[PDB]
Design a protein around this nucleic acid. Structure first.
Ligand SMILES: [Mg+2]
Ligand SMILES: [Mg+2]
Ligand SMILES: [Mg+2]
Ligand SMILES: [Mg+2]
Ligand SMILES: [Mg+2]
Ligand SMILES: [Mg+2]
Ligand SMILES: [Mg+2]
Ligand SMILES: [Mg+2]
Ligand SMILES: [Mg+2]
Ligand SMILES: [Mg+2]
Ligand SMILES: [Mg+2]
Ligand SMILES: [Mg+2]
Ligand SMILES: [Mg+2]
Ligand SMILES: [Mg+2]
Ligand SMILES: [Mg+2]
Ligand SMILES: [Mg+2]
Ligand SMILES: [Mg+2]
Ligand SMILES: [Mg+2]
Ligand SMILES: [Mg+2]
Ligand SMILES: [Mg+2]
Ligand SMILES: [Mg+2]
Ligand SMILES: [Mg+2]
Ligand SMILES: [Mg+2]
Ligand SMILES: [Mg+2]
Ligand SMILES: [Mg+2]
Ligand SMILES: [Mg+2]
Ligand SMILES: [Mg+2]
Lengths: 46, 206, 353
RNA sequence: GAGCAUGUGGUUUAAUUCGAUGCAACGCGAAGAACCUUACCUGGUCUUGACAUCCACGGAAGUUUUCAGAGAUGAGAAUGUGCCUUCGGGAACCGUGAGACAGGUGCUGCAUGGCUGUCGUCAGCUCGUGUUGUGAAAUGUUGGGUUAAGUCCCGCAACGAGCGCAACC
RNA sequence: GUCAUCAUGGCCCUUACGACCAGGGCUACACACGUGCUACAAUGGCGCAUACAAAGAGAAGCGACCUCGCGAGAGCAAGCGGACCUCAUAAAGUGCGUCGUAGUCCGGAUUGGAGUCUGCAACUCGACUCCAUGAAGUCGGAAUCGCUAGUAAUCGUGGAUCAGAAUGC
RNA sequence: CCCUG
RNA sequence: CGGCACGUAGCGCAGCGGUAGCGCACCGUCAUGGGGUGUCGGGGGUCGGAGGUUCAAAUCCUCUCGUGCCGACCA
């Protein structure tokens, strides 16, 4: 178990919201299999 | 877009009904229940005997069942005990006296139902679907069908994403009503899901 | 008698759950040990360690005999219920009902003492929902989380009112501070401090790509804003000196060590009054700095624990709800987001997280 | 705008089942919710089981009842005891005993089949061979006229064909 | 879009998310939206008399005639598995009278009493009849929709679903 | 005028 | 410390014996695929607090506690 390095530095109001506004709890992008972000240049096995 | 059924649009033109009895409103509902029962039972124990069509008619308190199939020898067995026991069981099912005619069908891969049964058989036994589609294509062209289109749909080859592949040659005029478009579907219960197959065969203008 | 059967079954199940969460045999082991070194007499030759031993002894023995008498109560109420079903002795069945209610209330007092162990647990609370760095998806998730928490507060019976609500321009609300009033509100809601992980097919995205947004619920009790007491004449050091009559007043607070001078006015009394207001202002400033320093130290500790703030995970794509801290799971996402978190909050509160 | 019908969102409750929720959800699935209907809630019950098969055991199946309970159900009383049959039999059907299993309107339409909406009944979409370009590709399908239409004439490195258009209904 | 018509890979449950019964709910209500019906009237309301259709359904059904009831309906009881009998006398129209521009002889919501029918049962929660009451509404902002001919607009009728229960289709 | 990574 | 200027809706501001007003903002509907801008239509104020006169007080008076300004000079 290792400490997380938050990018807010010295937190003096609220660290939970600080870790939200840190990149750790960021919203994450999913690569669609088909649809909008659909095109794959090369396959997983090709 | 979605297509209209070729048979379903061509009943009144060129395709005969596969049930040609008459009924009033009183006997209609359990009549179709009886037809559904006989058809599922005969397809269940004629699944291995190359069945194509089941045409049934009620003349008067009785049932005539004509089975258009390609292997009447294995249908009738060893001097007809198979068709005799099927006759007695279907008489039990329909509650009326029964008699069965077996119609041998020339050119089984010119029949549309047997092409669907064949292609679903290779999709069960894991033969490569594209090869089997081609194999049906030169079957139709070698026996002289004027046109054929075969379509397969689903998780082809165990893919994670389902898709549809269809092959066509000759004329497949779905919009021409007088055309003999013998069309039929089937399903494959593969270990990776359900694979649908559809067959269109154009066999002449009228 | 069917509710009585279900009720005894419920008490048996919750007693087993309480034993599992409390680790009864381990506390019994320290109880036996504390009894042993109490039996050796040197422990009362040292005063303060006997103080600690008396405290831990009383706590351990009380928990142990409580769980033991609930075992005895469960078994003898079950046996006498079996008597009361067949013999149909109505007074003895009423005795069973009374003793069963007493046992249930006394185990309720035990689990009560465990779950509301906080000093601020009885007070009302300020509960805040804030969306993450995601966008409108996080905004919508914060808003409907606020809806769910309102539904939970109304179902519990806590009186709610929205102190502030910062909304998003498209949909949802960016942040919201809510006063939840009622007895034991902070104790009931104190396990909600942390992060919720939404995974769902986002409607705001054009392609229907699923989104993994985050929100935080932060609860803090309504502490009493105590009055700032005035300073003492002995605690002050008052000097007078010539301005640059010795009307200049230098007031020095000695126990902290802070001075304020004033020399602008001919009146020494005016100089002293301005110096005394400067004294009060600096004392208020230093008290605020001390409070902010303590808050920053607590934030240092909870930023150190960091990733542990991610407490809850809703996978709406696969339709599963997960508390990572207690590790518990369920599938009724619509009930969870309706506000049926009673099982989760009880699991967390018996965990002590 | 008004009143009412109906659907939806939100709210609330025990539940206000669930699905559809740009156009292409919103008198939609539902061509019709007082009970069943209905998958929701409360309360009362059961567990090889309401719905099938297998094995063993006791039997007809059925027909009138009585009591208690809201009913499911639990207990009790009368009548039938056949059907075909190597008096070996054996099964329509009633209960029991287990386990192999039945079961789910539980989750995933972002694993699918089938079926449908949509652009749009818009007039396009391509292929074979040939040719040009190193190549992705291009031609055919463009040009001038014409038509509801890639419908048609002629010209044209294109020549033909198919799904479309049209007709056959 | 549909794993809630069905089928189906995988996952979850198997004295329970499975099964049975009763009651309640799906019909609630500060509110917002969608689609409809009826109005705000004299090109009309009310009263009296009298013309002109098409299509469809009917056996656990359509149900004529006669009698009673103001009525919804009730009792008796033909024909019809139907170009035969019933649903079923269409309405708008036409002729006359009154109303004379008023919240009115418009509107018909709401509410009270009294009933009929289906269904075990109409309270939550049906439809219809009578009597009584007579609400908003005097043509509707930004905005917005349908329609090129037997069309829009208006006036009726039938059917599916269904024991009963349409302003919907 | 703009269109969450 | 002495004067003198103001306490008006969430905010900024008018009104200073009988009447509470304007703008931004909030809500609801349109317009947009959606947001903004825009369009339609609403609401919201012990008039800083207290008490005195007057038929009546936001307006007149007193005190009060806030904020601003001007002077707290010769020695
Ligand atoms: Mg179609
Ligand atoms: Mg579902
Ligand atoms: Mg709904
Ligand atoms: Mg949805
Ligand atoms: Mg419609
Ligand atoms: Mg019901
Ligand atoms: Mg239950
Ligand atoms: Mg899809
Ligand atoms: Mg070349
Ligand atoms: Mg083109
Ligand atoms: Mg080209
Ligand atoms: Mg041209
Ligand atoms: Mg052409
Ligand atoms: Mg050309
Ligand atoms: Mg055509
Ligand atoms: Mg759709
Ligand atoms: Mg969906
Ligand atoms: Mg029920
Ligand atoms: Mg409904
Ligand atoms: Mg009138
Ligand atoms: Mg009908
Ligand atoms: Mg009026
Ligand atoms: Mg008028
Ligand atoms: Mg009409
Ligand atoms: Mg009906
Ligand atoms: Mg910007
Ligand atoms: Mg000087």
């Amino acid at each position: 178990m290792s400490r997380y390095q938050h990018t807010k530095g010295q937190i003096k109001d609220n660290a939970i919201e600080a870790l939200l506004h840190d990149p750790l709890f960021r919203q994450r992008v999913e690569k669609n299999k088909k649809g909008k972000g659909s095109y794959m240049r090369k396959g997983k096995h090709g | 877009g979605q297509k209209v059924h070729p048979n379903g649009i061509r009943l009144g033109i060129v395709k005969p009904w596969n049930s040609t009895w008459f009924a009033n409103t009183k006997e209609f509902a359990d009549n179709l229940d009886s037809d559904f029962k006989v058809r599922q039972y005969l397809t269940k124990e004629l699944a291995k005997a190359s069945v194509s069509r089941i045409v049934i008619e009620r003349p008067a308190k009785s049932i005539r069942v004509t089975i258009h199939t390609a292997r009447p020898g294995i249908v009738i067995g060893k001097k007809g005990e198979d068709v005799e026991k099927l006759r007695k069981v279907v008489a039990d099912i329909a509650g009326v006296p029964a008699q069965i005619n077996i119609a041998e069908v020339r050119k089984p891969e010119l029949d549309a139902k047997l092409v669907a049964d064949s292609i679903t058989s290779q999709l069960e036994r894991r033969v490569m679907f594209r090869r089997a589609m081609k194999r049906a294509v030169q079957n139709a062209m070698r026996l002289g069908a004027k046109g054929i289109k075969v379509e397969v749909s689903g998780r082809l080859g165990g893919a994670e994403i389902a898709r549809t592949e269809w092959y066509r040659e000759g004329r497949v005029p779905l919009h021409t009503l007088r055309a003999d478009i013998d069309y039929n579907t089937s399903e494959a219960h593969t270990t990776y899901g359900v694979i649908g197959v559809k067959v269109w065969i154009f066999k002449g203008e009228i | 008698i069917n509710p009585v059967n279900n009720r005894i079954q419920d008490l048996t199940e919750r007693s087993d759950v309480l034993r599992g969460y409390l680790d009864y045999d381990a506390k019994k082991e320290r109880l036996e040990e504390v009894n042993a070194e109490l039996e050796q007499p040197d422990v009362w030759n040292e005063p303060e360690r006997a103080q600690a031993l008396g405290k831990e002894r009383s706590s351990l023995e009380a928990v142990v005999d409580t769980l033991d008498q609930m075992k005895q109560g469960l078994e003898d109420v079950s046996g006498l219920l079996e008597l009361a079903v067949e013999a149909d002795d109505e007074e003895t069945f009423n005795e069973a009902v009374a003793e069963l209610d007493a046992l249930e209330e006394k185990l309720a007092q035990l689990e009560f003492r465990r779950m509301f162990s906080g000093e601020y647990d009885s007070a009302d609370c300020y509960l805040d929902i804030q969306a993450g760095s995601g966008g409108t998806e996080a905004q919508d998730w914060a808003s409907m989380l606020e809806r769910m928490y309102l539904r939970w507060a109304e179902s519990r019976g806590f009186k709610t009112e929205i102190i502030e609500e910062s909304e998003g321009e498209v949909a949802g609300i960016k942040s919201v501070t809510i006063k939840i009033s009622g007895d034991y509100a902070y104790g009931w809601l104190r396990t909600e401090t942390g992060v919720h992980r939404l995974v769902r097919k986002s409607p705001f995205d054009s392609g229907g790509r699923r989104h993994t947004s985050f929100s935080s619920a932060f609860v803090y009790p309504e502490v009493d804003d105590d009055i700032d007491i005035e300073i003492n004449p002995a605690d002050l050091r008052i000097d007078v000196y010539r301005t640059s009559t010795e009307s200049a007043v230098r007031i020095t607070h000695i126990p902290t060590g802070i001075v304020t001078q004033c020399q602008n006015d001919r009146s020494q009394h005016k100089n002293k009054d301005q110096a005394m207001k400067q004294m009060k202002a600096k004392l208020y400033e230093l008290e605020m700095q001390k409070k902010n320093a303590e808050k920053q130290a607590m934030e240092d500790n909870k930023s150190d624990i960091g990733w542990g703030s991610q407490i809850r995970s809703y996978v709406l794509d696969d339709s599963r709800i997960k508390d990572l801290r207690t590790g518990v799971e369920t599938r009724n996402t619509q009930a969870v987001l309706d506000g049926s978190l009673d099982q989760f909050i009880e699991a967390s509160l018996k965990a002590g997280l």
